[PDB]
Design a protein around this ligand. Structure first.
Ligand SMILES: Nc1ncnc2c1ncn2[C@@H]1O[C@H](COP(=O)(O)O)[C@@H](O)[C@H]1O
Ligand SMILES: Nc1ncnc2c1ncn2[C@@H]1O[C@H](COP(=O)(O)O)[C@@H](O)[C@H]1O
Ligand SMILES: O=C(COP(=O)(O)O)[C@H](O)[C@H](O)COP(=O)(O)O
Ligand SMILES: O=C(COP(=O)(O)O)[C@H](O)[C@H](O)COP(=O)(O)O
Ligand SMILES: O=C(COP(=O)(O)O)[C@H](O)[C@H](O)COP(=O)(O)O
Ligand SMILES: [K+]
Ligand SMILES: [K+]
Ligand SMILES: [K+]
Ligand SMILES: [K+]
Ligand SMILES: [K+]
Ligand SMILES: [K+]
Lengths: 322, 322, 322, 322, 322, 322
């Protein structure tokens, strides 16, 4: 029992994609556990422990694909679970949760600035960069490159069905960056004039595969075809612990109405099924580098990032369950 | 100088894409010349000849890329010009136009049917077929395969920006064919479950390359990647004769507002440019077969088709020129 | 309805693969039509017609995959048919069938010796050559080159399940050509030391694909991987005219007992299915040349062989049909 | 110089392949070292040392290719050696050897059951899986996934020349897993209908190459061609430490009579050589993952498995050497 | 007996490469037979027939690789041989040779202008074109493109060992074309900034392979890697008749001193062999188009150019031999 | 301010390529700092420190691309700076420099030897090896393989523009190794007869890419094309640490006159530009192994080498900076 408004409203805003982008989802989730601990009227520590377990279950059960979300939850609740089981009283527990979530948030913010600085060294003056969807990590790189006086242009793919490309196009243009907007279908047509591709990630697997917005794997295919470097800009908390032990990342199937509006789809024949995967999977061979906040790695070093940050927790249960 | 309303109206409708599809555009243009000839008020054959040349020009200057259009005009106008030059009187010239236009129309209808009968033999029971845009020729293949009692399913790509996949989805469904509808970005994600690709063509070049709806070349790339047969259904008048002598096909750049609607687009800053190519070009190494009315060829035999039907004409100027 | 025993024996020996290899099968079918003509006890020219038609159907319904068989029955029966339809009397029909047979049979022998001569020029002193199955056309190339005193070695893949590779190993060893015999699985391992690959063909399609003994496509694939020339030695009567009109070649599935002897298989459980495809299909992009009796072609010129020698016959029914 | 008969029997049964498969061979060598320790009649701790050293050399000189065998002898003898060199007395050495054996033997069994559990997560309901040879690690993956109630089918390649594929077909059929049995040559033909490929390993090198039964590289190659995941199921003790210092793995060449029975071969001429390589080598770029008991790695992380578990031992001589 | 100075001096100037480039060699050879017929002091036709046979033998036996040479010789001597065997008297024979050689020369000149016009349509404004060696055909294309006001730049590879790149670089610069000169080794480094590759040919095979200056096949390899169109500019008389019947083109091995000067090479150890192939062979898959004077073909249509111009003469002896 | 003549002279000789090869340049730079420290007239440690910083800068500003140079300077200067900052007196600082420089030199000599011992194990009896430029590390491999009695032959590419293959040819010949010497353009022509490629490195990046003599990347491309192992012999100090944080390696553009001599070049028009990159970059997918002093790695493990030796240093400024 007993969860605050902010937890529920955040969960609904993740589901509906009013809060979106794997990094932002992650911070939002940490932010929500932070408000539950702030506002909780719990008296006992075991009461609050149980509230935070249940806030965490609600937040995890929103969108499955970007592992940034459970890694945020984990980051807070490994520390909440240790404090609680160590024998922390109420206010010690409240501070552990509140602070762990402030920690993760700040670190996510810092990781992205840093990804931008690292990645922008791989951008050269005159570069035409093609991007996909709307990824804060990818945009940090492009923004920094432009602030360094590299005269760049970005090809923004519209990113059907949900139009994330429109966000990207206005954001980059607002920083002063020349933009070329095209449909997703025009990616091979314009790969010849493209020098660099920069995209984000929702989950990165142990073998180096990249799960990112539907279409990503196509752009990467034709980038390889043309020898255009595919650079994936991605925080360490995009990497997927459980792929270490064989798990496949779930691909989120979103509502048909995102593709065909309700007003039109109801008029269509029964024998047409609309299928709307929100993500696809790009194989490591088509990735040049993964730019984390810890540096440039080849895609196959994803196992090392995981071995050293996340491996230890795979013998344990999730820090929010019974 | 004295041009019937039908010529102008056909022209407006081709430009606007109310009349669309390479094959249909070509028939509409014959038809238009047919009608100018039926309804001409001319008294001398010279006067009719002039109206036909001028109508031909109007029709040519509508859409560049689908060569079926100029080939239709040529079919009619080579015959009209040979009659005029050979001394024909007003009524014999009228008839040569009228009857030439009809022969093209009739031949076009028969060729789409025959293509269906031929391509269908390459479709097998249980096949999943992916297609792109709305191609009458490709549909004839799927439609016939289904009528032969092969249980097929078609993956239809929505085809941005103009949404031609909607036409295709609803049309195939009307015949009883199950459809799976997806965004263009999802073609690689679903290539693994696809057994055949079947698309159409606006122009085929001397070396075997296929100009078709923007996005076609991406679908073929990932099809090759996966060893899925790419079959292009396409009539002999889709073959481009000026490429035998080095010409490159012009790619139509259509209005930004087809991508981002007018309302929205004017709210955007200058430094975003919307680019809307209506076609791309697929190399012959990514085509398994071209299915024409005369049979199955590898794409490299495009030169043979062009030699034995269109080559004779490239010593002469255009049959509508002064 | 009065069919000589030789036709029945021939059909049965084609079925059991006692008579095997695509060219030899073809010659044996012509041979049977020849003996049916010779030994007939037909009063009328219509009684002979009817026997030949019936013998043809029996012979056609033995093994489907190697088009050689029907191209031979065609060669005879096109001529027998045209004779009977110009009102030929009896012994004029009998001789037509007898002399169409001999003519095809002799032209087969000449085409194979000529393929040798043309093919051997692409073999170079020292060459190591890998082959597959037992192909008399492939063997002619290898034998002639050794006769030219080029020092060659042949890698012979054993060719499961029916062990054709043993026939080849002994045949070549009998001309004094050193043989290296290996399992099929070992083709990649030895492809590094291989200089040329030379195989036969059962059917060759209009886009250049080559249907040949199960395994052939695997050898071709790793040959391409290593840039080893794949050379296909194939008479004109291996080219498959029905593929010009969209047809797909059928892949013979032979008895599971060829893989697991009947004694052993009956002891195995029901939930193991044994599948025994006798042919597979190699794409044209992995074939460097086809060596015919008319010359060397790229695989994609199969359509020209077909056009110029068989394309006429497709607009009519099979010559042995009613 | 006093070696118990069990060691000699074990060596001979490893040579004749009555005991086969890389993990089982390893366990049988540890088992033999264990029985030599148990049954020894050695007075001194140096007489036991000397017997174990000698037993080790005998066991090492049976089959070279599967590094499992020496990694097992190492595991025991590193510990037996360190004991004897710290002045251990007799029954302390005997127990060390006895308990190093049991410990390796049990850890082998656990690694294989864990590889099952990790591997099965990458199999999906409906999957068709191709394998090669008979690998207990590969089989554990397949068996566990069927135990999870995923409906799978396994394509089993017969694996010439020694027919290991028969052992696999019966083993899987015995757990109620539908089997499709085919010749090795047919792997490309059925790769289109295959969803996952799962094979074992005899040795795995420092750059990620996988040495496994002859044919394995061919399956991997056409799997890559078709974008079918190739998954290698391999205990840590299959990784080859000497490859870290440049060594190449030796490929066992076994008796020509395994290919052609002795009866038939003696009738064949001298100028046919029969070559029988028992393994081949697959490059890492064709391997999607290696499934170890410690997790899922990209093939290129083989060097980290080696570094962290064996790199120490390379600076000394083999533990059984003088 | 009895050959003029000009025949011998031309033969020596071909050998020494003072006359070079396959087209020019060809015209020079025709020019030489033309002077032998002009200046011959022969009295009988059979005398002159025999002089021209022997002039032709001397000219053929200079450099083997560019088939332009024997096709020039053939073009003259098919016509000389027919006139002579038809019963032509002296002056009829003299005129046949003189005129046939003037014919070939003029046609070669016209073919190159025409290749330039055709090819230049495939060059687009702003194009950076990479070329290799010095090819008149290739230079016609580039020159014409520049005369059309297309603002181009050419990357000229120096073309070791004989520095033909220096000729190319000065010739293009003298017409006004901006040039970038690089070593052969820098071709991949600069393929990313390259839009089009244009090279010539010495011989083109029946299957579409292109034999051209050593290095050509490398540039073509990396052009394919990057999707840069490889366009081969080549007269019909570059196509190689005898590859129709299996012949491999001979690759000319030129003197070691061209690579290492005599003054230096004499000082080098015996165990160093210098190898100097003057040409290599590019496979058809890396060629986009062959631009002949008859139009754009795919590389695989080389067989058609040969079938229709040269096929007929392969049943005959060379028109200069006994 | 007070710099010994040896520092300046070393600097001139590095720029001029009298001292050349990445490994030798690095030793020459340690050596130079060694000598400045031996011969300094300084009295305070501060004065010596300043001379060492200034000499370091002079040495750094010679050639950019081979990172071995800056790594050598760092090895010395990290140790010198830690001593200076930790309060060391004049003589203890002198000694730290002198002895640090010697340790680098000695370690470099030992590492080349060890690389040879390791790489040689990957060379097999009868191997043909192609190499490029003059690499001490690669030569150590070939030299050792030969000394082990493997009959090898080396194809040496001349390496324009500076002709480094001459050095390599004569050096390998001096050991008794047969050499085949070729122009760079001939690498694809001779790749079919090559068994191994063995080249060196100037810099290796975090993602595994190899910067080496211009032309290296072409040889590796066609090697991959042909399944010939590309082995890069290269010391740990060839690994580039600034690439871990996104830096791209600068490619040295050297003087036009190295390509075209001064005499000739001034006779050329303005509108020719000579471009002379001394390096190109080879992607990691085209490298089989890197052979370092610590063993064989796949190229993607470049990050591991960089992490465990150089990563610590990238929080600090350069140890020669103020
Ligand atoms: N759902 C998933 N979860 C994790 N990895 C995946 C998933 N789907 C595909 N992959 C991996 O991503 C790549 C897909 O390659 P392909 O199937 O060849 O497109 C491979 O490296 C797979 O291991
Ligand atoms: N000397 C030659 N004469 C004719 N064709 C050749 C010759 N050498 C190679 N080829 C062809 O050129 C291409 C060479 O491809 P590869 O050997 O894979 O480089 C193939 O299409 C061969 O048929
Ligand atoms: O795939 C998406 C968006 O998914 P959605 O819009 O469906 O959330 C983004 O590229 C990543 O999540 C990374 O973005 P960031 O770098 O901003 O985390
Ligand atoms: O596939 C086979 C034989 O199959 P099978 O044994 O099943 O008939 C041979 O490669 C071809 O028939 C060609 O042989 P030839 O060149 O002798 O026509
Ligand atoms: O290979 C060369 C030169 O060989 P070389 O210099 O050894 O004669 C040229 O590219 C062709 O011969 C075609 O040139 P063109 O188009 O001028 O015929
Ligand atoms: K590009
Ligand atoms: K598929
Ligand atoms: K080979
Ligand atoms: K598949
Ligand atoms: K380019
Ligand atoms: K090779």
């Amino acid at each position: 029992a007993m969860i605050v408004k902010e937890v529920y409203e955040t969960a609904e805003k993740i589901k509906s994609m009013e809060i979106r982008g794997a990094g932002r989802i992650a911070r939002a989730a940490a932010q929500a556990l932070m408000i539950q601990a702030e506002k909780s009227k719990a008296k006992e520590p075991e009461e609050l422990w149980n509230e935070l377990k249940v806030a965490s279950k609600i937040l995890y059960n929103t969108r499955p694909t970007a592992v940034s979300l459970p890694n945020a939850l984990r980051y807070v609740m490994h520390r909440v679970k240790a404090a609680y089981l160590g024998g922390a009283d109420l206010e010690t527990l409240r501070f552990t949760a509140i602070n762990s979530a402030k920690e993760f948030i700040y670190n996510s913010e810092k990781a992205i600035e840093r990804i931008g600085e690292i990645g922008a060294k791989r951008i050269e003056d005159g570069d035409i960069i093609m991007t996909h969807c709307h990824s804060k990590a990818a945009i940090s790189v492009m923004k920094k490159a432009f602030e360094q006086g590299k005269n760049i242009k970005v090809i923004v793919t519209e990113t059907r069905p949900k139009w994330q490309g429109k966000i990207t196009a206005k954001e980059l243009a607002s920083y002063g960056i020349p933009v070329i907007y095209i449909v997703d279908s025009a990616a091979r047509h314009y790969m010849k004039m493209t020098d660099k591709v920069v995209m984000g990630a929702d989950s990165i697997t142990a073998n180096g595969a990249v799960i990112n917005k539907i279409g990503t794997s196509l752009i990467a295919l034709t980038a390889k075809e043309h020898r255009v470097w595919v650079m994936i800009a991605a925080e360490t908390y995009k990497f997927h612990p459980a792929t270490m032990l064989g798990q496949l990342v779930e691909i989120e199937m979103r509502d048909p109405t995102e593709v065909i509006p309700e007003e039109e789809l109801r008029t269509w024949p029964k024998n047409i099924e609309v299928w709307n995967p929100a993500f696809d999977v790009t194989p490591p061979e088509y990735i040049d580098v993964i730019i984390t906040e810890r540096g440039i790695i080849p895609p196959y070093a994803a196992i090392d990032i995981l071995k050293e940050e996340f491996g230890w927790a795979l013998k344990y249960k999730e820090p929010w369950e019974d």
